[PDB]
Design a protein around this ligand. Structure first.
Ligand SMILES: [K+]
Ligand SMILES: [K+]
Ligand SMILES: [K+]
Ligand SMILES: [K+]
Ligand SMILES: [K+]
Ligand SMILES: [K+]
Ligand SMILES: [K+]
Ligand SMILES: [K+]
Ligand SMILES: [Mg+2]
Ligand SMILES: [Mg+2]
Ligand SMILES: [Mg+2]
Ligand SMILES: [Mg+2]
Ligand SMILES: [Mg+2]
Ligand SMILES: [Mg+2]
Ligand SMILES: [Mg+2]
Ligand SMILES: [Mg+2]
Ligand SMILES: [Mg+2]
Ligand SMILES: [Mg+2]
Ligand SMILES: [Mg+2]
Ligand SMILES: [Mg+2]
Ligand SMILES: [Mg+2]
Ligand SMILES: [Mg+2]
Ligand SMILES: [Mg+2]
Ligand SMILES: [Mg+2]
Ligand SMILES: [Mg+2]
Ligand SMILES: [Mg+2]
Ligand SMILES: [Mg+2]
Ligand SMILES: [Mg+2]
Ligand SMILES: [Mg+2]
Ligand SMILES: [Mg+2]
Ligand SMILES: [Mg+2]
Ligand SMILES: [Mg+2]
Ligand SMILES: [Mg+2]
Ligand SMILES: [Mg+2]
Ligand SMILES: [Mg+2]
Lengths: 61, 141, 261, 48, 184
RNA sequence: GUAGGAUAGUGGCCUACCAUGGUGGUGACGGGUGACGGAGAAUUAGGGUUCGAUUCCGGAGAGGGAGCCUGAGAAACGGCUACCACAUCCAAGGAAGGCAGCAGGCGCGCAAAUUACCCAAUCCUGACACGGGGAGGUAGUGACAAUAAAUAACAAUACCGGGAGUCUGGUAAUUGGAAUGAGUACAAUCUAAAUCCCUUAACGAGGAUCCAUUGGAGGGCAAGUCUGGUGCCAGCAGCCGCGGUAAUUCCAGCUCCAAUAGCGUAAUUUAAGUUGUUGCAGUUAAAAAGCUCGUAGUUGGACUUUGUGUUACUUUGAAGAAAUUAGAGUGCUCAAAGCAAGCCUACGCUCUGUAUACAUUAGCAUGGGAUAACAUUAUAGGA
């Protein structure tokens, strides 16, 4: 106890931060929101959508 | 005496190759007859208890060593497995699954038990040691 | 395999990159380019592991995709671009300019340059032959092809190349008495005077090099790179100046440093 | 041979419960008393 | 492939070849009780470490004294022994490394030095103090009794700033007793 | 061998014609392998023995064969065609199949985990700074293996020793106040998000039940000629042995011993100078062929300078993957490890470090020419 070590980044402006900073570190500081998604569900949608051709690809439930 | 020549490398190497066969330990591992043993090179084996038998202890001892004829599940060979400890034969029933192990002398008979080279470790998935010490009970009844 | 391998396992990467073995399963696979994959330093290593400008693989891409890094005077956006010996790396925003030279321990060192010295580089001539239409040309060991070279230039010579005019400014003939650097093998990074050339018909040619302190070492012709005519190199060398110290001597310096520092 | 006598003696032996007593120290403490009882103060288990 | 598969690990002790030698059992228990060790394993790893150091010295001594490897690694080995207080500046020869014993290494343990510097009443009291986060070597708290102290660090052994014995607040036993006394 | 054909190209690779060659006790050919090769692993005084499916490199395969398209690259199988073997759906007319990818299931067995989360790190790929990645990482299961390390410390009494006396040491579920993490938990931190660790408010020990186990106590071999039971029975016992009515050996209690968060039981190394090159034996213990000849093999006296014949040997050097091994530097709290870090307190520095050795045999290149091998010599085809 009694001492901690970390790493720090100071950006010239918040605009430069949003360009070079990874998304997860922007959510921690509140500069961005979190889009909730399931990777496995996205994969199953991809495989279901490639059995259909044309504009119906999206409407495939 | 020994061949000593600096150019005698082939003869020395081939002589030792032939003579290693005279060693019983060497020949037992390189003959390939271990695969024909009931365990076929394995440390343990499961089997089915065919019958509960007693074997007369070899002289000068006098006793009835409680064993069990077991047929190995993986190759169908029949062996005699000694059941150790006092009254452990009562924990074994015919047509029961038992784990067998060696008797400790690598396929050689042990003690005064004639022609027995295996012992019973488990019965019905439970170790005889646990049953002997009343740690566990056989799964039935 | 049924074709070309696109991955480089981290333990199979060249040792002079000094990559930690537990840093990951993979190392940057050097792209095709002027230098061989085993004798280069990909830009990702330079920007992230040597200069610390980037903290991750992703940040190196951001730096390069802004067109902020140049190699031999041209912007490069390929993360695994194979920058190699004598290449000039320039970063205008930081006003920095480095030359890739080996330190005496055989590893690439980013030798900071002055703005004046960053306008040229040295190249070793691979061969000279006639091209289409009987036009003579020479190619180097950094993948460059120069047409209409000086008739005096021959194989294994060194040429001074201006990165602006892209022309041969001057050249050094390969001969005994010149100062050379070793670019491969055990003696990589060592500088000395070429003392002898032992030719063996059908076999590799051996060259005996003598250090400034009298230490003599041999190597193959393919690992030699002439740096200057006589005894003065045409390029700035790092602090060691190609002088390889014994481990006993190196330990002596370290002990003294702790007493003073 | 006859298998009816298997477990004979172990069944005849009269049961005797173990006497609960204070446990001994563990680890380093155990090696401490074991060290005082052999260097600081007939075999170890003689029937004296 | 898993990257974790490349992490190295090794063994730190070997068991005796003869398990029931009465002479050895007598000598080992004397060192265990003298230095308050947990078991024979702690003594066996010190013997294992000592064997490694002696083996390195023997190989060097078998080479010519002008051999560069003899000179370089010999100096490093002597420098390593001096930095931990095993050898003396007057014993700067590889032959003196071969004369080291287990007691020399057990005397450099943090447990031994906490006791022989007066901080503890017994070698067994030092053991509990170390593991209970009451000791520090310089600025760092050390709770490993096998910590091998260096000569440059022996003079900085003191109680931790967070300990009741080093300026910190009293532990939870005194605090509860104080609370109970106040309630009365 | 010659001439063609085919191939990205060499080549009996294939065709025509011709020749009769090619390999072999220096083991060809054939057979066995529970045989992928290597880097390496275990054990090692030295020499050695054994292992090497598995994360690095090389090769090979995708149920068994064969064939092929596309393409820079495939004889590709998360591509196609056929046969064979299995097997799914069907409205019985057809149709679709390839987990030795990840997870999961069945089976086989002595024998092996979640049908989880994520592209944040490492890197790869595409038109691409952005998409994708069961590669890879994270967590779950996990006593394979490895590291550190609790289960008490101290004082005063009573009791018991040693150096009448009094200092020191040892015991007690006695009596006292102190210490503390296992646990629990605000919090913060950790992380892609969680979780664990580290840090920390509160809480958390007296029979500190917050109860250490696994094997033993005749010998080998550390520890009982204790007590009860059994009576050549039951059982023990790796080996020698114990048990037949006074059991140190069985079944128990007590006590004691060894290791200790571990310990017992069931291929291989050591011990083995019981495979012997170093380094064993052969009068009688196992072992000189009944005797001699004899080819290959193996081994061969002395002599040449002291005061472009061909090789072995020796010296030095070059080239040589990493990881592992040895080893330099470095206080992850120590350690197994890791490849980091250190310095001061500025908009930073030490060009920070990330050494070095080892690496059979064969091959390459210098120096040496003793020892040794082969070749050679008088009509000199000599200089
Ligand atoms: K031999
Ligand atoms: K290939
Ligand atoms: K061809
Ligand atoms: K031909
Ligand atoms: K293509
Ligand atoms: K990623
Ligand atoms: K990308
Ligand atoms: K010897
Ligand atoms: Mg003789
Ligand atoms: Mg592949
Ligand atoms: Mg050539
Ligand atoms: Mg032809
Ligand atoms: Mg023909
Ligand atoms: Mg093999
Ligand atoms: Mg196979
Ligand atoms: Mg392998
Ligand atoms: Mg196999
Ligand atoms: Mg596997
Ligand atoms: Mg592979
Ligand atoms: Mg294939
Ligand atoms: Mg299959
Ligand atoms: Mg195929
Ligand atoms: Mg598949
Ligand atoms: Mg595939
Ligand atoms: Mg398992
Ligand atoms: Mg406990
Ligand atoms: Mg008993
Ligand atoms: Mg004894
Ligand atoms: Mg009795
Ligand atoms: Mg016994
Ligand atoms: Mg033998
Ligand atoms: Mg003998
Ligand atoms: Mg006879
Ligand atoms: Mg005889
Ligand atoms: Mg002679």
């Amino acid at each position: 106890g009694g001492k901690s070590t970390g790493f720090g980044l100071i950006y010239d402006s918040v605009e430069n931060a949003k360009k070079y900073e990874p998304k997860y570190r922007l959510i921690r500081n509140g500069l961005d929101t979190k889009v909730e998604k399931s990777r496995k569900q996205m994969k199953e949608r991809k495989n279901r959508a490639k059995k259909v051709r044309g504009v119906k690809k999206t409407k495939a439930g | 005496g020994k061949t000593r020549g600096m150019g005698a490398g082939r003869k020395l190497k081939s002589h030792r190759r032939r003579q290693r066969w005279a060693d019983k330990s060497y020949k037992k591992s390189h003959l390939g007859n271990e695969w024909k043993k009931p365990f076929a090179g394995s440390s343990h084996a499961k089997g089915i208890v065919l019958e509960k038998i007693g074997i007369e202890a070899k002289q000068p001892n006098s006793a009835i060593r409680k064993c069990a004829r077991v047929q190995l599940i993986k190759n169908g060979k029949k062996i005699a497995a000694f059941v150790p400890n006092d009254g452990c034969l009562n924990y074994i029933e015919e047509n029961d699954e038992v784990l067998i192990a060696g008797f400790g002398r690598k396929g050689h008979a042990v003690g005064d038990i004639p022609g027995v080279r295996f012992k019973v470790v488990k019965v019905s998935g439970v170790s005889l040691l646990a049953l002997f010490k009343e740690k566990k009970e056989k799964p039935r009844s | 395999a049924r074709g070309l391998k696109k991955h480089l396992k981290r333990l199979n990467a060249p040792k002079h990159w000094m990559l930690d073995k537990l840093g990951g399963a993979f190392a940057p696979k050097p792209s095709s380019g002027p230098h061989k994959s085993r004798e280069c330093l990909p830009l990702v290593i330079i920007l992230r592991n040597r200069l610390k400008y980037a903290l991750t693989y992703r940040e190196v891409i951001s730096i390069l995709m802004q067109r902020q890094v140049m190699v031999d005077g041209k912007v490069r956006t390929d993360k695994t671009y194979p920058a190699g010996f004598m290449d000039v790396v320039t970063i205008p925003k930081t006003n920095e300019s480095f030359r890739l030279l080996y330190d005496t321990k055989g590893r690439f060192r980013l030798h900071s340059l002055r703005d004046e010295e960053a306008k040229f580089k040295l190249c070793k001539v691979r061969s000279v032959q006639f091209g289409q239409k009987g036009i003579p040309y020479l190619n180097t060991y950094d993948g460059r092809t120069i047409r209409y070279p000086d008739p005096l230039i021959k194989a294994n010579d060194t040429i001074k190349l201006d990165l602006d005019s892209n022309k041969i400014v001057d050249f050094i003939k390969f001969d005994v008495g010149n100062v050379v650097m070793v670019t491969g093998g055990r003696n990589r990074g060592r500088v000395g005077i070429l003392k002898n050339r032992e030719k063996h018909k059908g076999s590799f040619e051996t060259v005996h090099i003598q250090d400034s302190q009298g230490h003599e070492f041999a190597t193959r012709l393919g690992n030699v790179f002439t740096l200057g005519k006589g005894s003065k190199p045409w390029v700035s060398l790092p602090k060691g100046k190609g002088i390889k110290l014994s481990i006993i001597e190196e330990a002596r310096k370290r002990m003294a440093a702790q007493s003073a520092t | 041979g006859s298998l009816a006598r298997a477990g004979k003696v172990r069944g005849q032996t009269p049961k005797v419960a173990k006497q609960d007593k204070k446990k001994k120290p563990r680890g380093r403490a155990h090696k401490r008393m074991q060290y005082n009882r052999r260097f600081v103060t007939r075999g170890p288990n003689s029937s004296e | 492939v898993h990257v974790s598969f490349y992490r190295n690990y090794g063994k730190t002790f070997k068991k005796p070849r003869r398990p029931y030698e009465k002479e050895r059992l007598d000598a080992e228990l004397k060192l265990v009780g003298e230095y308050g060790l947990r078991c024979k394993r702690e003594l066996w790893r010190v013997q294992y470490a000592l064997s490694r150091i002696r083996n390195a010295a023997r190989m060097l001594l078998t080479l010519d004294e002008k051999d560069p490897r003899r000179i370089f690694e010999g100096e490093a080995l002597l420098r390593r022994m001096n930095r931990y207080g095993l050898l003396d500046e007057s014993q700067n020869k590889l032959d003196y490394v071969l004369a080291l014993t287990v007691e020399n290494f057990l005397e450099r343990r943090l447990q031994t030095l906490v006791f022989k510097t007066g901080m503890a009443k017994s070698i067994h009291h030092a053991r509990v103090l170390i593991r209970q986060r009451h000791i520090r070597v310089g600025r760092q708290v050390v709770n490993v009794a096998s910590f091998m102290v260096r000569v440059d660090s022996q003079k900085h052994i003191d109680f931790s700033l967070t300990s009741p014995f080093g300026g910190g607040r009293p532990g939870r036993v005194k605090r509860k007793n104080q609370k109970s006394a106040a309630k009365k």
